[PDB]
Amino acid sequence: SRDVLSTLKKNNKNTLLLFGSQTGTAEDYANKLSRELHSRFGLKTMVADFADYDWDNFGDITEDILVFFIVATYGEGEPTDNADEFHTWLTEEADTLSTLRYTVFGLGNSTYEFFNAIGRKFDRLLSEKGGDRFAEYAEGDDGTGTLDEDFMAWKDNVFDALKNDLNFEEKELKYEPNVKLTERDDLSAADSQVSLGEPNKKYINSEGIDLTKGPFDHTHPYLARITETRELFSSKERHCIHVEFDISESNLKYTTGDHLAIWPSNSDENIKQFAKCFGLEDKLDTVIELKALDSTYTIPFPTPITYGAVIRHHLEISGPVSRQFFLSIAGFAPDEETKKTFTRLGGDKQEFATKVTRRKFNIADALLYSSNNTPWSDVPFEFLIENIQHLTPRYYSISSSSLSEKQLINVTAVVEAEEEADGRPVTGVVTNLLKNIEIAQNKTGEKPLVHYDLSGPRGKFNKFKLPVHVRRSNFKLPKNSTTPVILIGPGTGVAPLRGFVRERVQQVKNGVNVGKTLLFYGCRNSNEDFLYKQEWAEYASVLGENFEMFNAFSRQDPSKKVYVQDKILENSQLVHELLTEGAIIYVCGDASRMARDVQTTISKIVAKSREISEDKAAELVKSWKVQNRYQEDVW
Ligand SMILES: Cc1cc2nc3c(=O)[nH]c(=O)nc-3n(C[C@H](O)[C@H](O)[C@H](O)COP(=O)(O)OP(=O)(O)OC[C@H]3O[C@@H](n4cnc5c(N)ncnc54)[C@H](O)[C@@H]3O)c2cc1C
Ligand SMILES: Cc1cc2nc3c(=O)[nH]c(=O)nc-3n(C[C@H](O)[C@H](O)[C@H](O)COP(=O)(O)O)c2cc1C
């Protein structure tokens, strides 16, 4: 079953699309491309997760299979978890791939140093080992906001290659469903086999199954009770939530520095606007059953299920709208005046960006703009199941210590929310869910901007439970507790660093010899947004002279805006002294600006302190990253 070649043949497929994805974008692109290849070119396509196959025989792939690799870069130039075994195979075991025909699209972000390392590496190694690159490599940049249009441009070039180099006939895009829906008017919420949004089918049967026992992963979460929450900012307009999850009654395990994945549900406001857009407002309790029309299509949620459960618990209805979604759905436009507007917007990259993307429209808002509020009632709900990405967990840096509190997981989440001039709320799904929980749990009297179902499917999320799982990270304290560490994490970057500090505090209490800990923190104003302000002196009391903390306030004084890199420079003698003692550097938080400014500042310190050029020092600091002496948890 893990032989991909045998799987292609058995399913009568001639086209393989492989996705390396951590948060689902690469998977969604592979699905989008697959459907278009099938409709426009008649290709018999299979979308595959690298993790579902073993790769030892892949060198035997035949010339009649076209392979598309859609691959994200993660961590520090590393493969996505699902692609790790393929990456080990290609880099270490693969010999030749003499009849492979392939093309690669990389997903990455140019604010990271190893930009699109994986797409570039796959594309190069596949060629070096004898593969035939049939369409040029291209890559997308999530750091500058061009990723989606980069993908569209690459896809256009792939289609040119198919049509003009391989002489395939290209037909017009048409919706060719891979799934069939049937309404079950005989079923209702009263029927226990009907999903009301449970995370998977194990949560629907579960009469005498232990839902507290292992293992928990991206296919199977633990419903973790939130025992307490706290608003950490004093600002009325900007919020950050401390969350404590009780895991004591379960086999869910974590280690300091790991990530918690929180499984979302959508807000009432976004659901309402989605149902209005598609004429589903009187159908939300109606039960549907889904059947695959293609032997390699996996229905992405339990069936049977209600429309409302699919929309609330399974579809990523919010977020930037791909122009490819406009192109795919245009055939279902409700009327001619709409089709004219919608076809124009879908075909013009720049006007799409101005009229849809920069307004931060969700699907529902963009389609209703285009149709002057006429519902898109001709859109088959199957089309939406296939063309909107599955609602994916968000990761949080755990802020508790597994040594100190093995039975609790903390996270520290800044809430993303704004209102547009036209009154629309533009919200982060998970973070507004956590804010709603904090408001309700603490009876705060704040009015939530958007609202969620805090009880969940059949009341199964009651007493403020959410589905979670833990992802193991390589962001880890040194094996040797006497090794000094330098911890840099302004804003929510402090989250894993709180975990680290709490671990070292407990270690000192366990009579362990712990090395020096230097922490560089920053926020706007000591009286506004200083995370965990009270705790740090308590930690200092335990750790003694083996802990020093320096704080940078960016807004306290307008004449002197101060950031963590300014405090690192001010304390350069100490920082470098610790580096000479083998200190490990950990940088956490904002990838876009902070991480790069900090790295530059550290490089300058190394250059001055060691009498080497700035570029030689920069290259040395880069080698520390490769060697895991300089670690990042930046997003
Ligand atoms: C390894 C890792 C560790 C992390 N650690 C932490 C941490 O410790 N703490 C923390 O706070 N975060 C952390 N994050 C970030 C976190 O995973 C989330 O990305 C963040 O909390 C936002 O999630 P959300 O569901 O609220 O927002 P999302 O729903 O993903 O929305 C993202 C943004 O898009 C905006 N938006 C919504 N709709 C639209 C639209 N139509 N057009 C344009 N924009 C729109 C939202 O308002 C928001 O600003 C980490 C990320 C990673 C990868
Ligand atoms: C924690 C983290 C680390 C990342 N590391 C890199 C990197 O080293 N190089 C890069 O080009 N992009 C990097 N990215 C950008 C992702 O590849 C990019 O957001 C991509 O679109 C995600 O695709 P996915 O949703 O399929 O996982 C990183 C993103 C995150 C969140």
Author numbering: 45 to 679
Provide passages from the article that reported this PDB entry.
The structure is well conserved among the different kingdoms, possessing an N-terminal FMN-binding domain that is connected to a C-terminal FAD-binding domain via a linker region. The enzyme transfers electrons from NADPH in a typical order via flavin adenine dinucleotide (FAD) to flavin mononucleotide (FMN), which ultimately shuttles the electrons to the protein acceptors. Analysis of the CtCPR sequence revealed the presence of a single membrane-spanning region comprising the first 22 amino acids of the protein and in an attempt to produce more soluble CPR, a truncated, untagged version (Δ2–22) of the enzyme was expressed in E. coli.
In this conformation, the FMN and FAD moieties are in close proximity (~4.3 Å between the 7-methyl groups and ~3.6 Å between the 8-methyl groups), allowing direct electron transfer between the flavins. Even though only 22 residues were truncated at the N-terminus, density was only observed from residue 45, suggesting a relatively long flexible N-terminal region. Electron densities for both the FMN and FAD were well defined. The FMN-binding topology is conserved among the different CPRs, with the isoalloxazine ring hydrogen-bonded to backbone atoms in addition to some water-mediated hydrogen bonds. The FAD is bound in a fashion similar to that of yCPR where, in contrast to that observed for rCPR and hCPR, the adenosine moiety is buried, sandwiched between Pro364 and Val470, and hydrogen-bonded via N6A to the side chain oxygen of Asn406 and the main chain carbonyl oxygen of Phe405, in addition to various water-mediated contacts to other main chain atoms. Apart from the direct hydrogen bond formed with the side chain of Ser441, the isoalloxazine ring of FAD is mostly hydrogen-bonded to main-chain carbonyl and amine groups. The interface of the FMN and FAD-binding domains are stabilized with various salt-bridges and extensive hydrogen bonding networks, suggesting strong interactions between the domains.
